[model samples]
Target chain A: MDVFMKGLSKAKEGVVAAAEKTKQGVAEAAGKTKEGVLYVGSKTKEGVVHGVATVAEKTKEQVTNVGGAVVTGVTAVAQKTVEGAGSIAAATGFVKKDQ
Target chain B: MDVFMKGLSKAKEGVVAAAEKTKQGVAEAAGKTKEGVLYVGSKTKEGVVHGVATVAEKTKEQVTNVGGAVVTGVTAVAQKTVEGAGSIAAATGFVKKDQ
Candidate 1:
């Protein structure tokens, strides 16, 4: 009976010791996980920012190139219209093709 | 002199005709190019929208997971505190470990 009582007491002490050790292990794991989460957040944000930055610059450049094409296209149309008007004027005697 | 003058008039007409054809080609090409730009713009916008949508959902999910990690970590810390307090209480005789 004395041995049994002493064994029960020893088991209770062991429970206390195990609980403290579990708490220490929990702390170690939690710190590593915390660090891992922060690192993932930082790297993901960096990748997203860089991706957005690159896409916009290329899109902007392409859109601007089309704008230039539109300008040149309009100039060609205007020149054609002026030439047509001049030929009509010559046919109707408003202007003479004299040599 | 008469043939030369006639040749000049004929050359002018040819120049006018060639200009008109070039004008037509320019107009056709411009129209095709404009359609292409519209198509490119639509596709790019779709891609950008889809990409942003994907990023938002993933970002929100990751942030929430990290938030969970933070909550769990804090809970562990609190639990450790309570355990430490319980041990201190036992050592100070606030509770007796009776066998």
Candidate 2:
């Protein structure tokens, strides 16, 4: 049981590590999306293509929208997972000494 | 040039996805660690292990300290990466209309 606890403890560490990666990914995406939207806007405003301006504006909004969606979704998933893990830890008496 | 912009946009999307994952990872680690510390402290105060009380007390503190470390560390890395990606996106004129 103690061994299991130890293993579980490590597994927990792994989870944090992965989350770090995810956060990094999200930030990277935001950077790209922002650039794309602004680029589109700049081009459209230049009258290079018909309705380009409109598209660019919408797309820019989308960068933020998409970023928000991704962030909110991830947060929800993470929160639920934590809650679930907590309950399981309790059930297994994993945190208790005599368990 | 337009195609490149399109590609960049997609790349940005990828970054956001990754960030989301990292956030989730961080949350999960927090959950497991919290349980561990609480368990240890509870056990130690009860005199389960010799000198365990002192250790458990310290261990509980360590868990929070560690969690904070991971969170802050990941955030710093992600922030820097995002800035770098933004600069690259600009260099490519990926957002500029005439590019």
Candidate 3:
């Protein structure tokens, strides 16, 4: 969330700066508005793309970590279950305990 | 340049990975193409957005650095001009110097 907000602000600032610069140029060229818009648009577009990538990478890493944890949990449960079954068998004398 | 390229590749990889994951899900769902496509599209969109942001920040930083350099050069020139004028005044006796 913090990462995204910062990116948003930077994007806004880029657009604002471009608009201000364009305001001056447009007064002279009259057609400078398009240039200014394009400049801002391109910068904003770039900002958005990079922000998304960073977020995606972060999300991916997190999900992978979660999946790993879940696998570990399941494996632990399976191991415990096998041990419990063996204990039951020994208690019932279905499988003799040497000790 | 290098920064932009790196971001681009990461974005591509993210999209590709998402697509592959979706492909597997779609295979199971029967009507999964749409879902898969949407999933890939969303991830791609996110990747694109973040990639752009990264590039924008890098570009902005580079431009600011260049602008600072230019300002420094201009200041140096202004200082030199003032010093040159004073030197001329002394050399031509426009202002007598004790030393």
Candidate 4:
């Protein structure tokens, strides 16, 4: 139980870390993405907001593509996990029964 | 479904990839272990098998210790997974309910 609880907290900590990492990445991407758009062209009349929005739009599109990749990647992972977990669970059951 | 199925096949490919890697590592670890055992020097006429067996025996003990360590480590990991999964499931349920 202690081990289980310790593990739980540790996992929560990791998730938070992952989430913070994701948040930082999004912010950084948004800023860099916007800057990149501004840098591309149009320093006048369009406004930074529009420029940022354009970049954000492009970023959103790129993000959509990457999101597709990630969904691809994650679904890939989840499936493998299911298969592996199934095997492990089966093996564990065999051990328990045999024991 | 195409995405999901693509992910599945991709995962199967990955599993095969992982299995090959695991086999290579196990072979390498065994070879290194046996070589290290014999190099510790009990050479001469005890036979290669005996020498190898002795090394294998010691390796088994070390492996058992490692296995215990792994079990502890995995149980820790599993506990964390459970917590994380629980939270994700909860959040997902909330999302589903909202949606």
- Compared with the true structure, all predictions reach lDDT values of 0.16, 0.18, 0.15, 0.14
> CA lDDT of A89 in candidate 3?
12
Most accurate candidate by lDDT: 2
In model 3, the number of clashes is 19
lDDT by residue (A1-99, candidate 2, tens digit) is 112211122121221111122231222211011211222222111101111111121121211110111121122122121222111110111111231
Give candidate 2's whole-model lDDT.
0.18
Instruction: Please give the distance, in angstroms, between residue A72's alpha carbon in candidate 2 and its true position after superposition.
Output: 23
Candidate 3 lDDT, tens digit per residue, A28-83? 11100121111111222211212222222222121111010010111100111111
Candidate 2 matches the true fold with a TM-score of: 0.13
Mind giving the per-residue lDDT tens digits that candidate 4 earns over B1-99? 111111122121221101101110011101001111112222222111111111221221211110100101111011112211211110010111121
Off by over 4 Å in 4: A1-52, A55-69, A73-99, B1-99
Q: What would the per-residue lDDT of candidate 4 be over residues A28-98, giving only the tens digit for each residue?
A: 10110121011121222211111111122112121111010011111101111221121111001011112
Residue A41 accuracy (lDDT) in model 1: 16
Docking class of 4: incorrect
Q: Please identify model 1 stretches exceeding 4 Å from their true place.
A: A1-50, A53-99, B1-17, B21-53, B56-99
Model 4 CA lDDT for position A71: 10
DockQ of each: 0.01, 0.03, 0.02, 0.01
Per-residue C-alpha lDDT of model 1 across residues B22-78, encoded as one tens digit per residue: 111111112211110111112111111111111221221211110101111121122
lDDT of 1 at B28: 15
Show how many residue pairs clash in every candidate, following the order shown: 0, 18, 19, 0
Worst-scoring 10-residue span by lDDT in model 3 chain A: A68-77
Q: Which of candidates 2 and 3 is the stronger one according to TM-score?
A: 2
